[PDB]
Design an enzyme around this catalytic site. Structure first.
Site, PDB file in Angstrom:
ATOM      1  N   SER A 169      37.292  12.582   5.387  1.00 59.39           N
ATOM      2  CA  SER A 169      37.360  11.923   6.755  1.00 59.39           C
ATOM      3  C   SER A 169      36.839  10.613   6.482  1.00 59.39           C
ATOM      4  O   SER A 169      37.394   9.496   6.569  1.00 59.39           O
ATOM      5  CB  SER A 169      37.913  13.169   7.693  1.00 59.39           C
ATOM      6  OG  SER A 169      37.397  12.624   8.588  1.00 59.39           O
ATOM      7  N   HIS A 190      42.593  12.848  13.152  1.00 62.72           N
ATOM      8  CA  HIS A 190      43.880  12.426  13.004  1.00 62.72           C
ATOM      9  C   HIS A 190      45.339  12.806  14.190  1.00 62.72           C
ATOM     10  O   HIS A 190      45.681  13.550  13.069  1.00 62.72           O
ATOM     11  CB  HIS A 190      43.401  13.369  11.780  1.00 62.72           C
ATOM     12  CG  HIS A 190      42.260  12.905  10.719  1.00 62.72           C
ATOM     13  ND1 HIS A 190      41.598  11.972  10.702  1.00 62.72           N
ATOM     14  CD2 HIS A 190      41.447  14.134   9.895  1.00 62.72           C
ATOM     15  CE1 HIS A 190      41.245  11.720   9.533  1.00 62.72           C
ATOM     16  NE2 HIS A 190      40.013  13.226   9.598  1.00 62.72           N
TER      17      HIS A 190
END
Ligand SMILES: Nc1ncnc2c1ncn2[C@@H]1O[C@H](COP(=O)(O)OP(=O)(O)OP(=O)(O)O)[C@@H](O)[C@H]1O
Ligand SMILES: Nc1nc2c(ncn2[C@@H]2O[C@H](COP(=O)(O)OP(=O)(O)O)[C@@H](O)[C@H]2O)c(=O)[nH]1
Ligand SMILES: [Mg+2]
Lengths: 208, 352, 80, 326
Positions: D98, D215
């Site tokens: 990430s 996300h």
């Protein structure tokens, strides 16, 4: 087959050949003389004349085999027998004087009786007509029920719910459960005996 | 009970006790052997609820050599060698049990192959930055050394000041037990605590305070190779381990007042073929040069008397449950399939 | 980056050094004052010991050779 | 064309790998103290002290964990270069989860430490702001062959539609390995999923200890700040094949990293697809070496689940201790 039709299967029994000529019937005598003429196949790797040979345990080992790995299958079988022996010795040493007479410690007796307790008497065979397969109760042959006991034991021990418990320890526990008429394999036998009594409508078709 | 002997004192076994089993008491089993016995012999001890060892020629010869030992000459290296599973470990255990009863100070290494493979916590020694420590392996040994030798830890006293940390030190004249405790409580100082113990036992025995038995099983590990690696995946040599470096000093015959008894073992060894059992083959050139001169003692398969007595012992414990095992034909088949090898016979009898 | 290899010679060897050291210590313990390293190394027991060691190092290692080494070492270390 | 086995693949961790003691075992290695000094210079606080010894609650806060992970990952790359230069020399791919993506680019010569760290700081702050904006969260779920994920998301939305909230969010957020996903959105949806696991056929269910729904579209407010932060930065051509988290393929031209790095902020992480893209091959073909440069060993477990044969040649760079004192 690489063998001709002439070749016959060998007889590995060792006490058969020592049978005295006097005890031979005329029919058995004729069979003995007839085998003199026949060609005989080479004995396969496996059964021998050893006195510790056990065909049932050999078939169980062959049914546990994966990918031709016989060394591993036999290793698992002997580990299971050793585990059963050790557990029974453990229970025998902790038992009272009057409970020791009823504790079986021979792992072979336990294995045979456990498999015998799991053999079904009745099963179902599908039969085809009308586009609809019909499930008729059928009395299972001896071979079929002996096979089904082993297959159910092995499938029960291969269940994925047993996470990281090694096969010898699962199999010894399942065998000792079945020795006492308990466990999931006995219940699987009972659920077939009940699902064959639930369908006695077609109970008399004798030509499966 | 033809396979048993009522003489359970290893100081009195002789050639007439060959092939017979003698019993080791539970107290002796807990004190003398917290760690020594083979993994598959402790299963038998737990299942039979007793630990009975057969008396054999190797152990009898090695006991004869240890009874007539001169404690003024340099320590003599005795090396037990033989094919796989012939019983050299239990011969060493017989000798250790003899020496423990006679108030020898036992320095028993149950398997030296564990120190050169499969080590997770490997440190760099603060004492000497060119060596590596094995705290989990040294603290595990210290507990059992403490168990075996509880009596002497207060009688034996150090002869130097040992500095563990700027705050903590062991001052001269303290009992050796403190050192052992410092290794069992703080594992960071376990490996340093083992060496000190060795350095003390090798010295004070020379002074004559006690007799020291150095029992090392799988001694071929010390002069071979390791499977331990650095962070850059480079190999580590055995002499770079402090635990292995300190144990090699004990194998040198530069001290008196004791004996050095050891056994080879291909089982658990690294980079040795399965059929290697001879002293030079397992030791290597370096190992042979180190142990030379030494007395090699051969352990073989059971002879007929020992084999018959071993099966009689199993029958007396009802451990052979097959109906054909008691018979003569069953005995011949066990003999052929095992070839009188103690380990193969035990493994075959386990599942019958 | 050349390398050299050769057979075993007992002289100037580790086995000679080790047996000499052990025999000096045994004499010291005996209280004898006999440190001549030619008198110690010229006995018949040292001849048999070096024969056994050279056999083990140059020829094949079998149990007969191991037993010969055993007996030579026992005679040298006074073990019976 | 090197045989698979000589080349190396570097995997950079992301959110959730923070641990107290991070950095010890890397400081004495070359060039790491200077990296933490630059981290001080850019951030405005001492990252070194927080990573080494912190309450773990400050370290679990979003504004702090991401810069810490980024800096630790690059320090681990330095340590790996010191120990095994050939491993760094023969590098074929790079990938981050990430925030580790920002590390991977910096390792690939597409960005610099200062600009990358500033971007990570802005990203973390903006995400935290959006997290306080609306309550939200993350839930890791492991399913069975009978499990329906989109379906479970639909009823997870139906519940809180019945409760009544504007365009409720509950969507799969991380594809990490077969049948194991992470769903993101409002607490009530994930709560509903926990108690209807049995109906939805979820073996295990575990709330991730994160601030909000990463996300997903809930982090839309955080797109524009980070967007600005990337305009000043001049991204170059990555030297090694760096794989993206939006579509799980290699970054091909530098003119698209700017927008993919912002789309990742509100797009599910395609980790399983990245593993397939890097490691999938015919049976019998060898695999490259794999090094998880950074804290933790999570990506090791995910690789083990994704591809066992690739995992056989996996190793992790230890950031909590060192064998030898350099
Ligand atoms: N003296 C003995 N008394 C009783 N049992 C013995 C004896 N020696 C060997 N055995 C039996 O043989 C088994 C193996 O023996 P042991 O562990 O001593 O073998 P080993 O020769 O040291 O083997 P390895 O090469 O693996 O080190 C023991 O578990 C025990 O069952
Ligand atoms: N921390 C510490 N360890 C010691 C001390 N003394 C001995 N030891 C340990 O005990 C062992 C003694 O071995 P030694 O005979 O001195 O060999 P050497 O140190 O290499 O010269 C060493 O390997 C140390 O690990 C000490 O004063 N402090
Ligand atoms: Mg042994």
């Amino acid at each position: 087959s690489r063998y001709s039709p002439e070749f016959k299967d060998p007889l590995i029994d060792k006490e058969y050949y020592r049978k005295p000529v006097e005890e031979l019937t005329e029919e058995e005598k004729y069979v003995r003389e007839l085998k003199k003429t026949q060609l005989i196949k080479a004995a396969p790797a496996g059964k021998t004349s050893s006195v510790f040979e056990d065909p049932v345990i050999s078939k169980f080992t062959n049914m546990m085999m994966i990918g031709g790995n016989k060394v591993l299958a036999r290793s698992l079988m002997i580990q299971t027998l050793e585990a059963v022996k050790r557990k029974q010795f453990e229970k025998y040493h902790a038992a009272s004087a009057e409970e020791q007479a009823t504790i079986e410690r021979n792992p072979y007796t336990i294995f045979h009786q456990a498999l015998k307790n799991c053999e079904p008497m009745i099963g179902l065979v599908p039969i085809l007509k009308g586009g609809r397969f019909y499930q008729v109760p059928v009395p299972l042959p001896d071979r079929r029920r002996r096979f089904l006991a082993m297959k159910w034991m092995i499938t029960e021990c291969r269940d994925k719910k047993h996470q990281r418990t090694l096969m010898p320890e699962k199999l010894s526990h399942k065998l000792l459960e079945a020795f006492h008429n308990q466990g999931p394999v006995i219940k699987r036998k009972h659920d077939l005996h009940k699902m064959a009594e639930a369908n006695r409508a077609l109970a008399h078709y004798r030509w499966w | 009970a033809i396979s048993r002997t009522n003489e359970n004192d290893p100081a009195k076994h002789g050639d007439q006790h060959e092939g017979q089993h003698y019993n080791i008491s539970p107290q002796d089993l807990e004190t003398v052997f917290p760690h020594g016995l083979p993994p598959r012999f402790v299963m038998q001890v737990k299942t039979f609820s007793e630990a009975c060892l057969m008396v054999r020629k190797p152990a009898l010869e090695l006991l004869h050599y240890l009874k007539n030992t001169s404690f003024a000459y340099p320590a003599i290296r005795y090396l037990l060698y033989g094919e796989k599973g012939t019983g050299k470990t239990l011969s060493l255990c017989h000798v250790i049990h003899f020496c423990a009863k006679q108030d020898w100070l036992i320095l028993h290494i149950p398997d030296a192959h564990l120190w050169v493979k499969n080590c997770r916590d490997l440190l760099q020694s603060s004492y000497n930055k060119q060596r590596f420590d094995q705290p989990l392996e040294a603290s595990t040994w210290l507990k059992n050394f403490k168990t075996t030798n509880e009596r002497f830890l207060n009688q034996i006293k150090v002869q130097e000041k040992y500095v563990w940390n700027k705050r903590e030190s062991t001052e001269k004249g303290s009992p050796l037990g403190e050192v052992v405790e410092q290794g069992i409580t703080r594992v960071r100082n376990a490996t340093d605590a083992v060496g000190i113990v060795l350095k003390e036992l090798k010295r004070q025995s020379s002074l004559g305070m006690f007799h020291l038995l150095v029992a090392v099983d799988g001694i071929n590990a010390l002069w071979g190779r390791t499977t331990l690696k650095r962070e850059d995946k480079s190999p580590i040599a055995p002499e770079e381990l402090a635990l292995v470096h300190n144990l090699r000093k004990m194998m040198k015959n530069d001290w008196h007042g004791g004996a050095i008894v050891s056994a080879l073992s291909q089982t658990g060894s690294l980079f040795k073929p399965r059929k290697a059992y001879l002293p030079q083959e397992l030791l290597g050139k370096e190992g042979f040069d180190a142990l030379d001169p030494f007395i090699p003692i051969l352990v073989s398969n059971y002879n007929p008397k020992e084999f018959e007595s071993c099966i009689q012992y199993y029958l007396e414990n009802n451990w052979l449950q097959h109906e054909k095992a008691p018979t003569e034909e069953g005995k011949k088949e066990l003999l052929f399939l095992s070839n009188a090898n103690p380990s193969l016979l035990e493994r075959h009898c386990a599942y019958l | 980056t050349e390398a050299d290899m050769e057979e075993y010679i007992w002289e100037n060897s580790s086995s000679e050094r080790n047996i000499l050291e052990t025999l000096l210590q045994m004499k010291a313990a005996e209280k004898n004052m006999e440190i001549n390293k030619e008198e110690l190394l010229g006995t018949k027991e040292i001849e048999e010991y070096k024969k056994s060691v050279v056999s083990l190092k140059n020829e094949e290692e079998n149990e007969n050779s191991i037993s010969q080494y055993k007996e030579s070492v026992k005679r040298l270390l006074n073990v019976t | 064309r090197r045989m698979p086995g000589q080349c190396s693949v570097l995997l950079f961790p992301g959110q959730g790998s923070q641990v107290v003691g991070m950095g010890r075992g890397l400081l004495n290695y070359p060039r790491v103290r200077e990296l933490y000094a630059a981290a001080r210079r850019v951030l405005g606080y001492d990252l070194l002290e927080l990573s080494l010894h912190g309450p773990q609650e400050t370290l679990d806060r979003t504004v702090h964990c991401q810069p810490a992970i980024f800096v630790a990952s690059l320090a681990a790359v330095e340590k790996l270069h010191h120990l095994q230069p050939s491993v760094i020399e023969n590098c074929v791919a790079a990938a981050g989860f990430s925030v580790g993506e920002f590390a991977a680019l910096v390792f690939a010569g597409a960005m610099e430490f200062a600009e990358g760290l500033y971007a990570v700081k802005i990203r973390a702050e903006a995400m935290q702001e959006a997290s306080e904006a609306v309550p939200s969260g993350m839930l890791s779920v492991l399913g069975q062959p009978q499990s329906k994920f989109n379906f479970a998301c639909l009823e997870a939305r139906e519940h809180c539609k019945s409760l009544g909230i504007e365009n409720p969010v509950c969507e799969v957020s991380n594809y990490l390995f077969p049948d194991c996903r992470v769903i993101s959105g409002h607490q009530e949806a994930l709560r509903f999923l926990q108690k209807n696991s049995s109906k939805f056929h979820f073996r295990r269910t575990r709330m991730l200890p994160v601030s909000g729904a990463f996300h997903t579209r809930l982090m839309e407010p955080a797109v524009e700040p980070l967007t600005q932060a990337l305009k000043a930065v001049d991204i170059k051509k990555p030297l090694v094949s760096v794989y993206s988290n939006v579509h799980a393929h290699r970054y091909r031209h530098p003119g698209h990293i700017h927008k993919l790095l912002a789309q990742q902020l509100v797009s599910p992480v395609k980790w399983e697809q990245t593993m397939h893209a890097i490691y999938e091959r015919k049976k019998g073909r060898g695999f490259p070496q794999t090094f998880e440069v950074g804290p933790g060993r999570q990506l090791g477990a995910i690789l083990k689940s994704c591809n066992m044969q690739a995992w056989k040649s996996y190793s992790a760079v230890d950031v909590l201790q060192t064998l030898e004192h350099v």
